[PDB]
Subunit: 129 residues, 3 copies
Amino acid sequence: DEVLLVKKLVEDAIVPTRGSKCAAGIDLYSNTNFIIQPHERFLVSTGVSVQIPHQCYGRIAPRSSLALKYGIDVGAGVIDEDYRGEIKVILFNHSNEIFNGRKGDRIAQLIIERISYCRISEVKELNTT
Amino acid sequence: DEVLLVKKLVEDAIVPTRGSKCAAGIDLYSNTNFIIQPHERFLVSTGVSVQIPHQCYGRIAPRSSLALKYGIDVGAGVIDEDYRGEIKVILFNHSNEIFNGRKGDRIAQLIIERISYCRISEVKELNTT
Amino acid sequence: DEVLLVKKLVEDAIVPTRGSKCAAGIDLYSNTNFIIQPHERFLVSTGVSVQIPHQCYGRIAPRSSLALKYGIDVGAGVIDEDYRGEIKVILFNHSNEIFNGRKGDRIAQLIIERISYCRISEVKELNTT
């Protein structure tokens, strides 16, 4: 059993949703209206915090439609399993047009990626490949 | 046993290839010639669809050489295990020069990432870290 | 047991570090001072090579603070388990300001992602979803 726990930080926050049965990504919603000028960026608040399942992290990924239509990209950051702050998404507007975001819009996806917490060891030489 | 199934949507599509024994990424090939103006973007067609193995997704990743030499980046999107459409890659040209892409060029990589389909649960408080 | 092995390629390289107990990412440090002009990019040397654990790869991810404050993004490239070259990070400066990087600065994160080395098979049709 694995569960992503979600806390609403404000009453009208939208709990992230999985869009299809085997959607890799969980949709993240903006809690505010916002404007991104051409070739600038904006830090978008989702209104939620999360507790990621053990030995995973949450990767922020772009929505394809916003990339295609509007030139929006998202930093591929990292929501750690121990992070308890609000999820906030940095959107880069790589177009020549102002981007208008609305409260309640889907603006990114969170993917629950399996990772290794391997220890790190310094050595004088690596093996050959 | 895990297998990535690939359907050619056009007869001259190139089946994606794994480049070295433990290459994380599978090379994606353009099915068309294309031009990307400076500081603009272009949606590149690969000519294939795929069926990703269970409990994985396909992440689109940039080729390092195109980033280094030409300032190309790729959105880090998400090919879901249930997606049966053509794989199309959004390339951002963050340089001051026109980028000329050719049919048959390697233009991105697909990485088959392990993920969790955890359910999502709203709670009033998360644990402390 | 999984271990990330790290070789210093120069004596003053900094071994990458995991920042919190369940930090997804391992901090990568610059081995040089560098300057990135507005809306340009720079390939930053870390001074280390690595041996990633089996059935994983190292994904280069952006540091959130540099994205927020300075408009820095990183290509989400791929350090293969068989790669024995120096880790070098492509930083894109999507702001209007010069970015000044210093030797010893944390400039990206490496995430040890679990992946599939599935074989690739061409077929005439995929299943329906």
